[PDB]
């Protein structure tokens, strides 16, 4: 058997956990608890949008007690251990998929867009107390389309332990799309532009380039079918921290037609000819604008692979 | 074979008789100067414990795992099988143990705790040969 | 195997508040107000 | 046997040694014109992984899963 082998189990599966809970069942649930750990009544709408602090024993009231007949070993200690060990899958399967408390069902790891909201809510005192402090700075576990990432709030050192202070409602907690507080991990592939009388990024016409990607690092980021691709070009001021042009003044999708050695190559030809020239009429309307190229799967999925935000003539 | 003298391996189809008692198989008579060898290998098995009859090569009867109340339930999940054999005075004494999920078997009996001891739900092939 | 062998295993009110609302006379046609207004 | 020329099958009792390393067994020397064959079949096992000693034909030590 190879390393992709995986099996079902008795510890993170069903049939073990029974209809029981080590917490108190009452008629003021869960709002009494939300206020009791400091959530303001002005923002009680978030009581069902974000869980109790994973740092406190109350969070684990939802599960059958670890001593009762048939219960899984689930405690705030076992949670933190798996967290710092990097066993994020066991957290999803043992705890997250079976929280199901606070009358909310779509508990998930927060997205990058959701941590951004959590930082704003924490600073504005709209959360529980322990989380109003927690989401100010630190390294936080995020999850976008089944993929784990660590986002940084406040520029903390890279060796700060990963924090997952609370899980959030997948749809109930509204994310913020602007990148301000939670700074992500964008991937930049090593690529060569062949230039010469070929690649061209100068005002007055269409932008064309011909890059070249390496196969071994495409397979590391989930790109083994080297024709299941699509390209995006962005025009605007890139983000000062990550370098991506998240809200470009001009966005354009194009499809490639290339087919060499231990690497494979891909073209790119903007449609700036035989239509509005406006790519160059906006790319070169402001000296701080830059042009960036992004690679996705054919339907826009996959690990987003970014080129540098170039100046004129790929500088 | 590689400087050692050997006899041809001969094979028998074996099952334990009900009652969970060890299986007695007679050792082959070895030529002068050679000693007895034995090996048991897994053919068919389930977690049925005592609720089975595998003595037919052509079909297998499996009635499920013994529950704590003595009734016959579904086949519990499996964790290990041990085949042990000891030669004592011209007789190979064969013992077996099937490991299944705990918390299903009664507290006492042939099938107890997490073990099906010398179960009928097992067919093994017995090979014998002689070597120096 | 000895007897120390052990393995994992697979095995070892609810009508609130809508029942109360009907009991003190709220019609089922307008039970949506049961969570909008408190008991008398 | 059925048009194929064969040598008698010969047997050894084998278990893996510590380290999770593959087990090396030297191939028998085949007569001129024949090539080596091999087959491994299951005798005893548990889910202990490295926490076991099955090297005795008469008993099996199984200390559970890591």
From Swiss-Prot, chain C:
<comment type="function">
    <text>Involved in TCP pilus biogenesis. May be a channel protein.</text>
</comment>
<protein>
    <recommendedName>
        <fullName>Toxin coregulated pilus biosynthesis protein F</fullName>
    </recommendedName>
</protein>
């Amino acid at each position: 058997f190879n390393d992709n082998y995986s099996s079902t189990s008795t510890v993170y599966a069903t049939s073990n956990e029974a209809t029981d809970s080590r917490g108190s069942e009452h008629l003021r649930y869960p709002y009494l608890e939300c206020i009791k750990i400091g959530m303001s009544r002005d923002y009680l709408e978030n009581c069902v949008k974000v869980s109790f602090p994973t740092s406190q024993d109350m969070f684990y009231d939802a599960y059958p007690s670890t001593e009762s007949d048939g219960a899984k070993t689930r405690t705030k200690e076992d949670f933190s251990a798996r967290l710092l060990a990097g066993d994020y899958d066991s957290l999803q399967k043992l705890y997250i998929d079976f929280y199901l408390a606070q009358t909310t069902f779509d508990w998930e790891i927060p997205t990058r867009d959701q941590i951004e909201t959590l930082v704003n809510y924490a600073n504005e005192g709209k959360l529980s107390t322990a989380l109003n402090q927690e989401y100010i700075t630190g390294r936080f576990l995020t999850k976008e389309n089944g993929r784990y990432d660590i986002v940084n709030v406040g520029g903390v050192p890279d060796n700060t332990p990963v924090k997952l202070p609370a899980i959030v409602s997948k749809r109930g907690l509204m994310g913020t799309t602007s990148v301000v507080n939670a700074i992500p991990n964008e991937i930049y592939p090593h690529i060569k532009v062949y230039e010469g009388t070929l690649s061209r990024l100068k005002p007055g016409g269409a932008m064309i380039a011909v890059l070249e990607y390496d196969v071994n690092e495409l397979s590391k980021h989930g790109y083994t079918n080297l024709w299941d691709v699509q390209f995006k070009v962005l025009v605007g001021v890139p983000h000062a921290e990550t370098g991506v042009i998240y809200d470009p003044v001009y966005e354009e999708t194009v499809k490639p037609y290339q087919p060499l050695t231990g690497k494979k190559l891909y073209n790119v030809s903007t449609n700036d000819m035989h239509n509005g020239y406006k790519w160059s009429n906006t790319m070169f309307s402001n000296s701080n604008y830059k042009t960036q190229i992004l690679l996705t799967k054919g339907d826009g999925s996959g690990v987003k692979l970014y080129s540098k935000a170039y100046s004129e003539n790929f500088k | 074979s590689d400087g050692k003298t050997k006899t041809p391996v001969v094979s028998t189809y074996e099952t334990f008789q009900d009652g969970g008692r060890a299986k007695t198989i007679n050792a082959i008579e070895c030529p002068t100067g050679l000693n007895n060898r034995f090996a048991a290998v897994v053919s068919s098995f389930s977690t049925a414990g005592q609720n089975a009859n595998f003595s037919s090569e052509s079909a297998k009867d499996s009635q499920g795992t013994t529950q704590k109340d003595g009734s016959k339930g579904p086949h519990a999940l499996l964790s290990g099988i041990s085949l042990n054999w000891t030669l004592t005075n011209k007789v190979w004494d064969v013992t077996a143990s099937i490991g299944i999920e705990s918390g299903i078997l009664p507290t006492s009996g042939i099938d107890s705790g997490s073990l099906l001891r010398n179960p009928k739900s097992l067919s093994f092939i017995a090979f014998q040969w002689c070597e120096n």
